[PDB]
Write a protein that binds this ligand. Structure first.
Ligand SMILES: CCCCOc1ccc(OCCCN2CCOCC2)cc1
Length: 157
């Protein structure tokens, strides 16, 4: 109950496939500051299951290397809200998407990280505008964005 933008009418099957973390923001600098920061994660692909859960492939920098991760976000009664199982209850919210170009999401435990996902390794000014508007509300204190060259590299090097 801190992020209160969600996507009405979300069809989670339609988010399947390839995505690029074009921009990210968080409530605390420490959540994204170093390469190995806990929530500096780079999304690779979204794989919605038949039962409506959402499997997520990503990379993360750990121990001086770009590690692959696979995680599962389980559906809830709200179609735009999913839960991930770590030792704390942390939920994922889909704020807005057009399926074909962009998707905005936040994860929250208050600790909060949001990303602007895009389908192609290109700077979508309009997707970034909608991301910044969705965020102007929220209490973000660090924001990163990535150029096309970085978006084609593992962990955005
Ligand atoms: C529409 C769904 C977009 C994908 O949302 C998420 C992307 C990455 C996430 O990762 C959260 C942190 C994952 N852990 C980082 C530390 O290593 C273990 C995995 C969570 C949701």
């Amino acid at each position: 109950l801190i992020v209160t933008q969600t996507m009405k009418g979300l069809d989670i099957q339609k988010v399947a496939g390839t995505w690029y973390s074009l921009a990210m923001a968080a409530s605390d600098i420490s959540l994204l500051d170093a390469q190995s920061a806990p929530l500096r994660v780079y999304v690779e692909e979204l794989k919605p299951t038949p039962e409506g859960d959402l499997e997520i492939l990503l990379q993360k920098w750990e121990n001086g290397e770009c590690a692959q991760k696979k995680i599962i976000a389980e559906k809830t009664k709200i179609p735009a809200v999913f839960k991930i199982d770590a030792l704390n209850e942390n939920k994922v919210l889909v704020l807005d998407t057009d399926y074909k170009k962009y998707l905005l999401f936040c994860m929250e435990n208050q600790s909060l990280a949001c990303q602007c996902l895009v389908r192609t390794p290109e700077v979508d000014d309009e997707a970034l505008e909608k991301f910044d508007k969705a965020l102007k509300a929220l209490p973000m204190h660090i924001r990163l964005s990535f150029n096309p060259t970085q978006l084609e590299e593992q962990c955005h090097i």
